[PDB]
Amino acid sequence: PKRKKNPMQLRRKVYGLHFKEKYLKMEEWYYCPLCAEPKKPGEWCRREDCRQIKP
Amino acid sequence: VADRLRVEQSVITSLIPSSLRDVQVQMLMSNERNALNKRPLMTMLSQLEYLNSIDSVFILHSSLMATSTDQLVSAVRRLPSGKDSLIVTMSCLRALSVKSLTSPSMKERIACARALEIVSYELEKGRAVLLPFSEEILLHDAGAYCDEDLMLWTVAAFLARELPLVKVHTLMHSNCTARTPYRFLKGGHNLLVSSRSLYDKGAPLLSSLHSKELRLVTHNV
Amino acid sequence: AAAAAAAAA
Amino acid sequence: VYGGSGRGDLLYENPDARRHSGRALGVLNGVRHSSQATMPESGQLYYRKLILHSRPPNGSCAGLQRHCHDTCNWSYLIPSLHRCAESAISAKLWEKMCQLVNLTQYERQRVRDGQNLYRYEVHQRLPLLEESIGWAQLDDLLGWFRSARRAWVRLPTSSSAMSCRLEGHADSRDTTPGRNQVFDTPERVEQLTEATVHRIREELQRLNSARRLARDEELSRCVEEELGWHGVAL
Amino acid sequence: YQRGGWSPGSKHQKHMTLNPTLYLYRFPGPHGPGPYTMKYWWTLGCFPTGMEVPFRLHEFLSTYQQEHVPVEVEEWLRCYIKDPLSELVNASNDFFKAVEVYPEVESARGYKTLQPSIAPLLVPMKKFEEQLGVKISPVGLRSVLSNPVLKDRFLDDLFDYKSYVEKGGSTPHRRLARSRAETTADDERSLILLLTTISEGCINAGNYSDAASVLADALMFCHDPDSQATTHANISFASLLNADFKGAEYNGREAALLQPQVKPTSTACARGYVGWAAAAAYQDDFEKAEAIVKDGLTLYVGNEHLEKLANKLQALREEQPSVYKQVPRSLRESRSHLPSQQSRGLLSGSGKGFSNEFDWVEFKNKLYPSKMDPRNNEMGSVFRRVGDLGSFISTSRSMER
Ligand code: FES
């Protein structure tokens, strides 16, 4: 709140690592063997088969 | 393409000019003569006028296909636009062949073989441009040894000095050292060269290595 | 013999 | 020539002249020296190269990532000429001319303008057609002849508009290199006509069911009538 | 106090004394109405401030003036509709011309040449579809035209259809008029063959849903028992590839039931049996699949497809002892294994953070927030906070509701 910033001063944040981790991340996924939908490991559906066996 | 070149060598040799300097002057004089009252294989020196008409020229490099042929496929897809051209050199073809037959990377070997096939098809159809060994002799400096990188940069310097209006891009692997001629391909501190030796018609083409002006006018894309 | 028309006359 | 009209482009654009602009240029993107503030040295080959290559890719040119268009394809070039002729001469006027010299002054001037536009388009597309002769197709060559007929221009096989070269003293014509100018337009068009006739003959020789029989019959009848109209045989 | 411009569109802060203003909750900006103000426009009928004057003259002109037609004109337009037969003939003619003039793909070496886009074929296709009441897949047409053999097998069928229609035969129209019995005619057979070729192109492309739809339209057109059997077999295969097991099983059963009406030379019955068995296998009923394969073999001993399917089922049976039984009836369908299923899951799958049961819930035809979902009174549901409206206590718990 004291002086205007220039494009490079603004781009310092994208240079940093926190910005990349917060915005520029790619999720690893696979097709669920049961519902054949995109799925991230550790998260499942509420379907009975998914609950009983968790892909 | 070898058989076609052997058959059509006479026409190519007849069409190749004597002097490689003042190409713009020669083109203007030819245009004046035309104003005053089949198709052979396309090569750089015989088709300089075609290259001058073309707006963009992509110089191919062997390293481009170190892993895949996607970028070469993109270049050949750009070729049929009519406003763009692709320049392949005999040194580039030799490098592709040797690295396909010797490189320990199976991906590189298959990619280079596929690139050779693509370039062969493009030259067969005529949509591409070839620079045979004889034309390499005619173009390169008097007594300068040229590998793939040096031949590519001599071609780029010749295009920038004799055909400025043609936008010259270079297709090469980002890891290649030839992307920075003034940093890796430099003959040391020589008193007979300067930043204007690129535009000096009488100076050898490779004198442009010492300066960034060659890199200024050539784009690595 | 009548139909619903948006405007008449 | 990069950012402006190129090889087969129809739009005429003088890159140095700032036409098609609503603003007086204040910033020159391609600048090499501060002296170019008052001495831009435009027109000189190298500085003009810098400026034109700094210009962005317009609709004619395409960026290195955008997928280009196969403008150098004969199967696209021919329908372009057919569309040009169709736009120049309306269907009603074409039918009237085919049925039929009693024409309105407006219609006569429309026909003349169409012939002029077709000649200009042929001049612009000539290098691409010449390059695409090799891998053309019989249907597209027949379409070339049909488009010429529709435009009403009789090709110079050796009214007529190609036979006469455009006026202008040879000492003033634009001979500058890098611009796709065809001074010997009638000779080039005659050579192209001969080449396409030979290509049609070769395609028919290579080609040599009810559907295919009818296709061959109609193709032969077309070829015959179109070549007869244009003053060609075989 | 005052820091920016006096107008409401100015950014920086203002004060009541210097620049007193009215309470404008939300109004457009210098660059035109935004999505939020337009949502207010469509819902409330005017901008939320209320100081704006509603002005939908252009909308009125677009909709009401355009759809207005006097009684006499509305009555005579139907009588002056164009001639269906002539319009269909013209549509077929132009469609065939466009397909014939469609350029052939150049067989490049070292890479795959891009197939030329089909710009001029869409309008002929659209009119042909309108006239015949059928829907052709543009992807299928593109694949058919790209393939050389399929291109010929499509052009010949289209030419035969044109010839038979020009000869005065419109089998669908005549059948409809008579209904307002006989067997399939040459024109109808040619149309069925054309649709089958389009479906084959769709299958080659990978658009199994389009292939199935085209084959269903062909089945609708056809009336011959042999054509019905062949089309049912094709639809069963298309549904199997598209992951529609119920449809595949139904079509296979219909083909196997039409078996008797078909001559021995045809293989449509065997194809239908194979499709039914494959549908059962995908539904994970190995005993049913084996029984169906046994019946198909008993019917047509020596069929290559039946032998291949029997060998595959034998391999699966040899693997089964590892499980000591078949898949338990509890799941019986859980596993998904088809690329069509994967594509469907990618498209219509409930994404994380949106398009799920917690983002919006679709009521009869309306979108609702998860809290208003009438399918569950979960802890985040408004229905939970209601209770004892006045009739009776209705619940033993005495803390809420
Ligand atoms: S089927 Fe994929 S998460 Fe359950």
TrEMBL record, chain A:
<keyword id="KW-0411">Iron-sulfur</keyword>
<feature type="binding site">
    <location>
        <position position="32"/>
    </location>
    <ligand>
        <name>[2Fe-2S] cluster</name>
    </ligand>
</feature>
<keyword id="KW-0479">Metal-binding</keyword>
<feature type="binding site">
    <location>
        <position position="50"/>
    </location>
    <ligand>
        <name>[2Fe-2S] cluster</name>
    </ligand>
</feature>
<protein>
    <submittedName>
        <fullName>Uncharacterized protein</fullName>
    </submittedName>
</protein>
<keyword id="KW-0408">Iron</keyword>
<feature type="binding site">
    <location>
        <position position="35"/>
    </location>
    <ligand>
        <name>[2Fe-2S] cluster</name>
    </ligand>
</feature>
<feature type="binding site">
    <location>
        <position position="45"/>
    </location>
    <ligand>
        <name>[2Fe-2S] cluster</name>
    </ligand>
</feature>
<keyword id="KW-0001">2Fe-2S</keyword>
Automatic annotation (TrEMBL), chain B:
<protein>
    <submittedName>
        <fullName>Uncharacterized protein</fullName>
    </submittedName>
</protein>
Automatic annotation (TrEMBL), chain D:
<protein>
    <submittedName>
        <fullName>Uncharacterized protein</fullName>
    </submittedName>
</protein>
TrEMBL record, chain E:
<feature type="region of interest" description="Disordered">
    <location>
        <begin position="327"/>
        <end position="350"/>
    </location>
</feature>
<protein>
    <submittedName>
        <fullName>Uncharacterized protein</fullName>
    </submittedName>
</protein>
<feature type="compositionally biased region" description="Low complexity">
    <location>
        <begin position="340"/>
        <end position="349"/>
    </location>
</feature>
<dbReference type="InterPro" id="IPR011990">
    <property type="entry name" value="TPR-like_helical_dom_sf"/>
</dbReference>
